[PDB]
Symmetry: D2
Subunit: 174 residues, 4 copies
């Protein structure tokens, strides 16, 4: 009644957000699938919190699909200062905020390794979407959480977006 009622609203809200995501699978999508396709190293995906947990499942998906990739936590990379990433790698930074500090701090280091940077953000005017060689936008219009305490639609949009990159590359390799 009340509970089931509350659940379906969230579901409806996220299914509507996914229908809007259709437009964002555009040139940037293709463009990013190319940077990864020609990668002789590893696709390094990294993010914070919810994003981090998604970016994680994202890395496992790439790997089991023929795109070598691994997840790394921004905070952990800071110390070793991305000693796990080389010029041969391609980095995917995930953030809905687009203003995260951890990842933002790595920008200067990542930048001066001449490693391709792909950023998945919910705002094209963010400093990640900014500094990235290629920006993949996952902007959503409506959040399924009333107080916005936790990400819902944005989180799910990123997950699906990643699956579109995984399978896309898989097909590109015939």
């Amino acid at each position: 009644f009340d509970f089931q009622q509350a659940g379906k609203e969230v579901l409806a809200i996220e299914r509507e957000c996914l229908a809007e995501l259709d437009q964002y699978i555009n040139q940037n999508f293709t463009l990013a699938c190319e940077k990864m396709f020609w990668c002789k190293g590893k696709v390094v995906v990294m993010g914070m919190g919810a994003s981090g947990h998604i970016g994680r499942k994202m890395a496992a998906t790439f790997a089991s699909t023929g795109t070598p990739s691994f997840f790394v936590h921004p905070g952990e990379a800071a110390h070793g200062d991305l000693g796990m990433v080389t010029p041969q790698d391609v980095v995917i930074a995930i953030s809905n905020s687009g203003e995260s500090s951890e990842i933002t701090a790595l920008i200067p280091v990542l930048k001066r390794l001449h490693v391709p940077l792909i950023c998945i953000t919910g705002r094209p005017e963010s400093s990640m979407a900014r500094a990235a060689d290629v920006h993949l936008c996952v902007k959503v219009a409506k959040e399924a959480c009333p107080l916005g305490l936790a990400p819902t639609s944005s989180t799910t949009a990123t997950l699906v977006m990643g699956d579109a990159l995984a399978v896309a590359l898989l097909k590109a390799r015939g």
Copy 2:
């Protein structure tokens, strides 16, 4: 070709979600009630992909007013679930519903009197049977050519979890 393949996946999944609204049935309510009265911690656990999602799930619960944490089934094998107590609530995530790791903890999880909630894709799975409440997330179509990696299923578990989080949040205020 790329964008073509990318949208196909997006479509397939959006189609599977539309099928999910049915599973938000009485069980959903039932599960929300078991968790709503938990005085301990909502313990979420899973394997591989499920594990990754199950992690985001726990994080979402926490920031939502439902205290919870994630634990890997294998890790708790040695400790025999030393992190789980009677006043806790367990949410086992498993699409196969026949995961060995989790299956093993089942017995131990029962003689601890901990309300077990299972999120599976098979209503006739070992976990579905042994659980006090089973939350179904079955999907009819895979978005990956060789199912090398779960797609429609994993996203169905993610949104489902988001639906439990906010539901409970609204039940409070």
Copy 3:
């Protein structure tokens, strides 16, 4: 001969640090054992980078020893505003630095929540060292790494110091 030589020097450097640790198993150690012993909730362990991975194995050991406890990344709790930790929990913040921003950022919250705070650092004059209810020191004199690029002696001391809490608590029962 040149590699074995190097490997053996590290082993020796860390062993000499463990001998300096005996002193630190003092009144604070027992003081922390008690705070954990009467905990009715969970022993929430949290750390960053190297400390985190150890704090991770630390929680697993506690749990498998009879001390209910889990790991949680400091930055992750930043979002949930520490929604996974309640007043009847006990927090163990690991940091050799003792000035880590993330952990420092949570202090105010932990404080304003009435949660027993135990800190494991390598400097008795750090923020969390002094901001904790019980500081467990793991200071080391010599670093096994030439450029200090990665923590070596301090990291291994924290692992042992933790193993020293799990077994002690265990025996206490």
Copy 4:
């Protein structure tokens, strides 16, 4: 009593580390060499306690100049090791030396022509046998009364790791 039990655990472990020196032998040199010429990534993996340490190990390798990262054996199963290429070097951590998960990755790993290094406490183990270079970390005495949680073996692996990181670092400029 508490401090009494905390110091004994410390002694027992310090004793085991004193037994480790011997193992920092030829195999150590081999391991260091194959990792030194690695053009890809040093991929560390393990289960439970081993896993948490193998993690700090990867972090330590990286921050030291040895590009590396951790991956859970189970997770790698589904992707048939999609993370690893022929250009990589694998470090499998397992005290038991008979872990089912890691054993399964062996055939695949060999069929990739990737250099396999194993860190075990059992020279006669399956992964000790099937490895290109077995690095021994056997310990005579356990710090835990009921062996509910690894202690000496877990700590020996950690140090053995630190010894490869800095050893390789010094081998560089």
